[PDB]
């Protein structure tokens, strides 16, 4: 499988890029939210668990 294997974007993870981030993708009050409140669940997976694969 080629998912994209890029641990150095620790910021938009993987599918924070722009998948279901449109609700996270304004930290108010919380954390960055970007992630963990637009994801929370693969905001972690910023390339290291690269294997997701397919």
Known sequence: ???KCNPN???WTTQ???AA???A???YFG???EGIYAE???HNQ???ICGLRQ
């Open 9 to 11: 974007l620790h910021y």
């Open 16 to 18: 924070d890029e722009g």
């Open 31 to 33: 954390p960055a939210a």
């Open 40 to 42: 929370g669940l693969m």
């Open 25 to 27: 993708w304004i930290p």
């Open 46 to 48: 910023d390339g290291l």
């Open 1 to 3: 499988a080629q998912p």
């Open 21 to 23: 981030i449109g609700l």
